[PDB]
Ligand binder design. Structure first.
Ligand SMILES: Nc1ncnc2c1ncn2[C@@H]1O[C@H](COP(=O)(O)OP(=O)(O)O)[C@@H](O)[C@H]1O
Ligand SMILES: Nc1ncnc2c1ncn2[C@@H]1O[C@H](COP(=O)(O)OP(=O)(O)O)[C@@H](O)[C@H]1O
Ligand SMILES: Nc1ncnc2c1ncn2[C@@H]1O[C@H](COP(=O)(O)OP(=O)(O)O)[C@@H](O)[C@H]1O
Ligand SMILES: Nc1ncnc2c1ncn2[C@@H]1O[C@H](COP(=O)(O)OP(=O)(O)O)[C@@H](O)[C@H]1O
Ligand SMILES: [Mg+2]
Ligand SMILES: [Mg+2]
Ligand SMILES: [Mg+2]
Ligand SMILES: [Mg+2]
Lengths: 483, 482, 483, 482
């Protein structure tokens, strides 16, 4: 409930002027670069690399939750959501009379008076329902959260008495029911504002059509902008009924409420929406946007998106014996291991580096990734192979597997790794030099020259000179390597 | 669309006192009938300087909001107005009480004073029309915009009837009569608020029962016009017989009045009208035939083509655009698109999108040829047939359409957003040809800002042809210091 | 649409203290005189007598609409409806919390603390749903139409953007249906509010439950005072469905909406609700105020109501040969002629003057009333004798009977009055005499003797002194006559 | 009425950790619970001057708001509380996972370590109470207020259950079993929001099937009590005979727990208890016999009657009233009403209304005798049997009820409303008695105002009696000009 006083900006577009619902929203000019400025990545330094192994493991355990790199389609989705929100208030101007009054006074103007022609049906071209479809585990939900967290949920109005709910979310659970969607809407609406609509209308006595009609009444009462329905895949097909009647329910849901609606679903939901999507008849709506995994070869050349993302992710590792450069084959092996799917790309790193922290040397190679895939990605094999196969039915039918119990596995492996006593060559050198952490400089020195000469000579140098500047150490240690 | 009715007089003799006709918009000449359909986009001058994604979206919005009234729409508008206003004469609701007049005439004819009388006359005002034209010539967006002037639902206070002016049905994908019959109900229950589909559209009823049952609903609401489009699909299917389906379309006369308009590709005409009793009912009010625009009328350039192309060209969104359209661009446009209406605009839209993608920011004939060779693969035989000039061969290739064209428009928008990503840092960050010094430059990034450090390693290999790397690591700092 | 800004009077009763909805209503301190001020009547003078017979016919035809004399039951109905209207807003207090918050707070206080006892009885609806059963032709509809129109319909508030609809009127028609009442409520709300609720809520697709569900929402949104369903007698039982399920439907209407509701009917409709009426159960409610015709006698003496109405109605006669005093024989006869039913008593007197203006002498006789009775009370012969019988079944069977189309018959009475040739001697006397305010003396003293000498004597005096007031004229015309 | 649940500890050991008991209002001692029930009208100090109708309405409202506790109510409250909070120990929803405990007990019994173990405990029968007393003694008004403290629908959020604490069933006049069975569903889906009647109470099932479905429905929701009122209509009606009437109430053991309560008139005892297996189920938790109060207790006056009458006496609303009650009026009440509590308040209300009607404006013995002899006729045999005291004679007439009392009250209200008022100018018309007076009045209105007109008319007759109207006029006008 981020209630703010309704401050009225001025919109350059003449169509959106004078509506208390549109000008209360954030301005368009400052939000142009906000979509591309939404990137968030962990700031790492050799200080964090210096810490103990268990602290490093804890730090690298939280990679898949605080990392985000925007892609090309991530801006198209933002633009579509913005135009969907700001194109759906032209009909609900509170100060000006409703649409029917406009139609009636226009029709009396054309009869006698002076008005040559009137266009009665004004097409709702700017705003339409969207039927987001993409393979499970591609990044649909998190991108939606980070796009939609920019708009404040509640903007209270004082001159009028209306509560403006800019957006809303509905989340379906496992094997849910049709009435459970309406109950989820009621619960989320009560959560957002503080109302008690469940007490008044949440009784199971009424039918589903009553829920729909009362939902329309509530959505007309409050200024409602967007209605997002999430994870259509989880709806059970047994107790629900026919796919035809589920499609009829969704079509009726789109029309009755009167505000734009956004649906998210698996490619198996395309089977449900086969009938309504084939038809090109106007008024059906349901424009489709296809999320796809990152492709490599476009115009015969490797893509820039994958290279940039791979470098930016590879910069986020904490290993003593890593390799700075990235080989073409090293990239390729886990490319065809992962097939480009977004969710398992970070999973492969967060499993492989963690496993290498206990298997031995702290380096990444093709064999390590192959072993990790073969011994820790057991369920997701057929979908990953079918994506290479390319048969649309094979891809569609065997999707929607989510390889559960990942975080528990990460914590169990973390505690297993923490249960250890074996030494490593470099920690006794760290404790040998000092606890003052001049190992920050030692790392810049040790990679090029043998430690058996540096450690005594840097100890003598630090005895005669209490602490050399980090810039000035390398020339003088060069002098001792030159003597 | 519940528009209340207010009456206005009409000068026509036969429509003097009729509560259905007088509630419609007044009669208009050809000055405005073929001029009110015009629409165009705004494109203020301040919209040229914006992000590339917004411009791509605005370009993609073009084909839905552009309509140029040609020299043919006036005839269609006049025919539609005449057919709508000429089917209400036989269904006058406000009738002077005929009981007393009929009885008085009855006594006068029984006593011998009056030798003749007209007691009652049935309805004889059912006429149809067919409209066929080549695919992509715009037979549907030239009908929605014409019929968007008349409001659908009119409610009268004096009586208790609702006037459904027009209703549009589309044929299914496989082709049979029963889905048309049930889709009439499925398209009727949406304009009003009702539940006709579940109450009447049951499986027990046969086809003849549905046809005899449509009349009661078509008389309860004063239906004016019923347009059936995409009649193409019913040429050959599991309909039970071509002659049986033709018998259906001719026994659709028993529906009360309601003049109907049929729309189909030129493949429908020869197969579908091959008998006198059905041919005379298809062209009951003239069969309007359409054709693509011709470049040369009689050796003189047509003003229609010039005006349409110039008005389309004045709707361009590029940073580097030439204001005037050179003759070669128009000539190449007509050579590629070949005249059909739908391919004239698709070439322009795709050319603009691919010019945005390539970064040329200019439209040229070579780019149009490239797009026509690239994306319009399935339609080529139809264009070559129109180039040939053989009427039968053109009739054979007359139902070719681009598949998943809306899908391709999205895939061209995705590439736009990727290339726009460009930041000031990688004027020095994005070059890997400097050296492999980036192995150690990672620590050098935090040491100082690379005001000259990136040029320092850049000047390192320029100054030094070859040197051992292990000596370069401190000597780069020597170059950094000096 | 009397959108007056709410002026908040103060009422000394503790229950109505500081309620924004209640205070906007008119005050009740001298409403007894206001309730007794409903009386309305035409103004008639002696001038209208000398007009032509068509003008008198129009004047007589104007009497039924603009005559109203309050009786005993009107005061009781006014006070009861005032109690129902004003007691209906103690629950929906806008400034403080609603009912559910009060019950929850009471439960939380009785749980622990020292609030020993809390009563959960709450309000049954908010006032009893009165059922005003009475015989047709008694005058219910006009009584409500006048005593319910002294309250402004809409009180448009200022700080709260809500409309305080104070009363409403549903009305069924011949051969109605169960869903027709639900549709008509929505349709009639538009005329009171000016909106288009029928477009969004009046779809025929909705079931009977959804109509009531939406009615609950809209009745809670707009502060509603009353809901007067009228003419249940017109409904047909078999067309709607099960007759015994109508009582279930009406109980569901009373329970869900929550605002006070008052039905109207005839003893034919009583058998629908008789199951709840016989039981003294609290919660069934449906208290009945029985409407009965005027009784002639009280304690072995004529009832004062009958004579009080009779004299007042008898003062409106403008007969030319009329005597000042009403004779006792006709007083005895028309009660048994009409059984005291309120509607037809006035109708007999209306038709008597029209019949006497054409049949001959201008007076009132028992035979004239008998002749009118056989003329224009043919459809109501069975019900009148059923009332005479006194058996409840005979009265119940013959209820709902009304005379059709009396107004059209009045027009043909007037047309027949228009076409006549011969004239009365008094018509000759008024025509030949200069009847410009000189007529009054002649009329007031015409019946003393023959007017043959009177016609020139008044002229002699008037020409003797043209300038006189009638006040001084009367002694002189009286003095010259006796000579 | 969906009150959310907040728990509280209970001192009783057996009600340890069971939400159903602990979600209810806490225990109170009898005197407090039997003293918190009293209520009375406001009786504002200065509301003794008003219109007659408003005061008449206030007096008519008296019977619905006057309640006064007595001795038996505390015992009734204790029994009701014990029944409601003693039938919930068998059903404790909060149970730990009993699979492991039961299987471990089975293992230790099987291996020979243990010797005995109680696996599953099943409930047996149910408690029941019957409350019988002569009609009009307050067996329903004293039950709609004792049960008012307990909330009806408690909602558990941690679980998903609704606790329907109490439910009131009333048999109809027919007395058939299926009416009771369907009325249970009516009351239950009136308490909650549901449609149980259509889902279960169809015509298809027989009596045994609904009787068995009541158990499932009363275990799905946690019932606490079930009171059946007016059982006297099941004595000898068309319910299949007294044998099946006994068998149905005996077979009502199969309903799970839910201690039932039976209320009836003293005649129902003989019909309802004639077999040993049914009487011990009727009086399973006592058998309290109500009886009207008496003036004396043991050679001395009873204080409860004194308190009841004295407290009732102040509540009257009259212009001039004797606040200090005279003992003669109390003796008159005990002579007429004889003790039954229904008649005591009705006599007072009717006497007050008739006192306002007559204008005597005082409550005295004569008015009480007149109203008792006029109105309360049918109740006479019961009172005359009460005077004698013979058990068979009093048992013969313990079912009589006065009808049409509400209609009589409404007609009395109309009578006192129709008093109206007489202005002095209007009264002047009534002053004129001879018909000639009124005739001369009617002729002589227009010229003269009535105030001066009536006196000179009256002296005209007081001076000269036998002299005619036309001869009267000159002398009247002679008086008038002067
Ligand atoms: N563009 C992205 N950049 C970085 N991480 C991403 C991106 N998209 C998805 N992820 C990662 O994928 C993980 C799971 O994605 P999720 O939203 O669950 O997809 P889905 O809902 O389809 O399973 C997230 O923890 C997130 O870190
Ligand atoms: N006069 C016109 N100007 C510009 N575009 C037009 C015109 N007429 C039709 N179109 C284009 O044609 C398309 C519609 O073609 P349509 O009528 O569906 O073909 P078909 O009748 O073969 O189905 C629209 O997208 C519209 O852009
Ligand atoms: N005080 C009165 N004076 C004259 N007419 C009355 C009076 N009260 C009622 N009426 C008559 O009652 C009639 C309307 O009541 P009625 O038709 O019985 O109601 P409903 O239509 O509900 O049966 C009117 O025609 C009116 O003449
Ligand atoms: N404690 C009481 N004090 C005063 N009046 C009472 C009391 N109990 C009952 N009454 C009166 O009894 C009437 C209801 O009687 P009821 O209980 O229905 O009789 P029964 O139990 O025979 O059906 C009420 O009008 C009420 O005034
Ligand atoms: Mg998801
Ligand atoms: Mg088409
Ligand atoms: Mg009526
Ligand atoms: Mg009782």
């Amino acid at each position: 409930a981020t209630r703010i006083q309704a401050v009225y900006r001025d919109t350059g577009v003449e169509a959106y002027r004078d509506n208390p619902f549109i000008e209360a929203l954030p301005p368009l000019q400052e939000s142009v670069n906000s979509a591309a400025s939404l990137k968030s990545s962990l700031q790492l330094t050799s200080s964090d690399l210096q810490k103990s192994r268990v602290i490093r493991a804890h730090t690298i355990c939280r990679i898949p939750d605080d990392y985000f790199q925007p892609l090309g389609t991530h801006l198209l989705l933002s633009e579509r959501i913005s135009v969907m929100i700001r194109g759906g208030y032209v009909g609900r101007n509170p100060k000006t009379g409703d649409l029917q009054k406009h139609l009636q006074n226009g029709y009396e103007r054309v009869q006698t008076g002076e008005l040559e022609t009137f266009r009665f049906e004004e097409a709702r071209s700017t705003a339409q329902s969207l039927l987001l479809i993409g393979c499970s585990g591609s990044g649909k939900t998190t991108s939606l959260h980070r796009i939609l967290a920019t708009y404040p949920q509640v903007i209270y109005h004082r001159e009028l008495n209306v509560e403006q709910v800019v957006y809303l979310k509905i989340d379906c659970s496992h094997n849910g029911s049709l009435k459970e969607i309406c109950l989820n809407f009621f619960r989320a609406l009560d959560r957002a504002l503080g109302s008690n609509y469940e007490r008044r209308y949440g009784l199971k006595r009424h039918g589903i059509e009553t829920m729909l009609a009362l939902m329309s009444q509530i959505a007309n009462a409050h200024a409602l902008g967007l209605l997002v329905i999430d994870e259509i895949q989880h709806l059970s097909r047994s107790r629900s009924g026919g796919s035809q009647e589920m499609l009829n329910f969704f079509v009726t849901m789109v029309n009755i409420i009167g505000v734009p609606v956004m649906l998210i679903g698996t490619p198996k939901a395309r089977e449900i929406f086969e009938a309504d999507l084939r038809s090109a008849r106007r008024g059906a709506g349901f424009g489709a946007i296809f999320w796809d995994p990152i492709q490599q070869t476009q115009r015969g050349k490797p893509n820039q998106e994958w290279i940039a993302f791979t470098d930016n992710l590879w910069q986020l590792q904490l290993l003593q014996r890593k390799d700075a450069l990235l080989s073409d084959e090293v990239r390729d092996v886990w490319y065809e291991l992962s097939q480009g799917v977004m969710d398992i790309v970070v999973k492969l790193f967060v499993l492989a580096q963690l496993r290498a922290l206990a298997l031995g040397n702290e380096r990444i190679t093709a064999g390590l990734l192959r072993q990790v895939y073969q011994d820790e990605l057991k369920p997701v094999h057929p979908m990953l192979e079918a994506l290479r196969s390319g048969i649309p039915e094979r891809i569609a039918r065997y999707s929607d597997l989510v390889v559960p119990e990942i975080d528990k596995r990460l914590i169990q492996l973390q505690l297993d790794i923490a249960a250890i006593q074996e030494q490593t060559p470099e920690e006794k050198a760290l404790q040998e030099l000092d606890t003052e952490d001049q190992r920050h400089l030692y790392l810049m020195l040790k990679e090029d020259y043998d430690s058996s000469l540096l450690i005594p000579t840097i100890k003598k140098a630090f005895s005669q000179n209490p602490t050399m500047t980090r810039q000035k150490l390398l020339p003088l240690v060069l002098q001792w390597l030159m003597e």
